[model samples]
Target: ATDKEEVIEIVKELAELAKQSTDPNLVAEVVRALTEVAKTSTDTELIREIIKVLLELASKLRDPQAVLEALQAVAELARELAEKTGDPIAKECAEAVSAAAEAVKKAADLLKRHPGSEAAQAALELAKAAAEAVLIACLLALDYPKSDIAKKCIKAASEAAEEASKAAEEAQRHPDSQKARDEIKEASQKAEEVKERCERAQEHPNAGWLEH
Candidate 1:
C-alpha cells in the first residue's frame, strides 16, 4: 500500500532530479507517480503540486526536446485526470495546454541561438507567464465553484491562453522581429489580467459573480 504522502515525496524527488540532472528518465518517473496517485487520490492540492513540479522541471531545461516532451506529458495527464474525475478545473488546465506548447515552441526557437542567451531567458519568462495563467485558472475553479465567477474565470482563462499562444507563435516564426518581442511582453501582461480578474471576483460577488 503506497501512502499518498510517499507519492508526494517521490514526486518532489523527481522534480529535484529532473531539474538538476535533466535525466529524461525522471520525466517518466514523475509521470508514473502522478498516474498511480490519480487512481486513488482526490487531493486537488496533490494534483496541482505534480503539475507545478512538472512545469518547473520543464523551465529548468535547456533542451527543446525535453521541454516539449515534459509539457506534452503535463497536458496529457491534465486531460486524463479531468476526464477520470469529471473535474472542470483539470479540464480547464488541459485546455490551456496549447499556450504551454506554443511557449515551448518559442523557447525552442530561442534556444537554437544558444542556451542561456538573453533571448533564451526571455523565452523562459514567456513560458513561466503562460504556466502561471493555467495555475491561477485552477485556483479560480477551486475557490468559486459553480458560480458566475467560475464561468467567467474559465472564459478569461481561454482568452489569456489564446493570447499566449498567439504571442508564442509570432516569436517562433520571427525571432528577429521587434513585433514578436512586443507580442510576448503583451502576452505576459495578459496573464496578469487573469490574476486581477480572479481577485476581483473573489472580492465582489455583485460584480458578475452572482449571476447564476
Candidate 2:
C-alpha cells in the first residue's frame, strides 16, 4: 500500500510507541517496520519526515542496542531514498551513520572495562546489534558501489565491525561464564560475515579487522 493514509497511520503509531513505551527495543521495532514501508512507498515527503522522526527516536534511546536498531533503520531509509531520488548523499544519512558509530564505540568502551556478568551481557547485545548493522551496510554497498551514500555507509560499517570485535573480545575476559562465551561466539561469527561481505565487495579496509 503506497497510500499516504497507511503511512501516516503507521507513523502515528510509531510516535505513540515512542511516547508511551519505556522499552527501547519495542519502540525500535516499530521504527524498523516504518522503514520497511518507507522503502516501498512512493511518498518522498512522507519518507523524509519519517527519517526526521527516526533521528529523534535514535536520540531518545539510551540503550545501545535500541539505538543501533533505529540507526540501522535510518540507514535503510536513506539507501532507499537515494535509489528513489538518485541523490546518495543526504546530511541526515551521514548523521545517522555517525551516531551509530558513536553508540557502538560507547558499548565497546564499556565492554573494555570488564564489567560484571550482567553488564557484559547487555554490552554483548549492543555489540551484536551493531555488527548486524555493519552487515546491512556492507551488503547494501555491494549493490550501490557507485553511490556516495553507499560509500559512506561502507566506511562506517567497517569502523563498526572493528568496535564490535573489540567488544566481543573484551567480553570473553570472563572465561567461566557460559553465556558470555556463547554471546561472544555469536558476535564473532557476525563479524566474520561482515568480513566475507566486505571481501566480496572488494572493500579491503573494512575486511582487515575481520581477519581476526
Candidate 3:
C-alpha cells in the first residue's frame, strides 16, 4: 500500500528499533527496508531523513561484518540519493561510501594478522556482503569509468579468496613456493585494495565494490 499511514507505521517501527537496540544487523534491517521505500516513494524527503538516521546507525557497529552490513545499506542509499534531483537531504551520500571503504580496509587488517581465525572468516563474509551494493553501483554506472573501477574491485576480491584457497595446495606442492600463511596475507592485501578502490571512487560522486 502506498498510503501515508503505512509509511508512518514503518517509520514508527524503525524509530522503535533504534531506541530498542544497537545491533548492526538490526540497524541494517531498518536501513534496507527504508531504502526500498525511498527507492519508490513519492515522499523522498521524509524517507531520506529516516535513511540519514540509518546511516548514522552504521557508526555503532564494532564487528567488521556488522559494519559492512550497514555500509552496504549506506552505499545503496548514497547511490539512490546522488542520482536523483532533490535537496541536499541530510548529508552527502559519498560520505557513507567513504566510511564503508575504511571499514573494509580495517577488516582486511584483521584477516592479515589473524587469518583462519573467527575474525578473519567473519570479515571475509562481511566484505562479501557489500558485493550486491557494488554490482548495483556498476549497473548504475553502465560502461563508464565507475564500472571499470567496480570491476577491478570484484576481480581483486575474487582473486583474494582464490589465493587463500589454493595457498594450501600451492604450499604443499612447492613447499618453498610460498607459505600458506604468506599467501593469506597477500590475499588480505588484495582484498584491502578492493576496498581502497571503493574509497577512491567515493570522491568520484559514485561508488562500487564487490565479492567472491
Q: How do all models score by TM-score?
A: 0.61, 0.46, 0.40
lDDT of 3 at 172: 34
| Candidate numbers sorted by TM-score from highest down | 1, 2, 3
Per-candidate total of colliding backbone pairs? 0, 0, 0
lDDT of 2 by residue, 17-135 (tens): 77578776677668767777777767776776676567556656667667667767776776776677676454334443654455566665665566656546555565655545554
Query: Candidate 3, residue 66: CA error in Å?
Result: 2.7
Taking the tens digit of each residue's C-alpha lDDT, what string does model 3 give over 29-129?
Answer: 66567667776765655555545455445544555565566566666665566566442321233443544355456556555665655435544444443
Winner on lDDT (2 vs 3): 2
Total clashes in model 2, counting residue pairs 3 or more apart in sequence or in different chains:
0
Question: What is residue 161's positional error in candidate 2, in angstroms?
Answer: 14
Q: Candidate 3 vs. truth: CA RMSD?
A: 11.3
Q: How close is candidate 1 to the true structure, as a TM-score?
A: 0.61
Candidate 1 off by > 4 Å: 25-29, 32-49, 52-56, 59-63, 110-128, 139-154, 168-180, 192-212
For candidate 3, which ten residues in a row score worst on lDDT?
A: 136-145
For model 2 the local lDDT of residue 5 reads 62
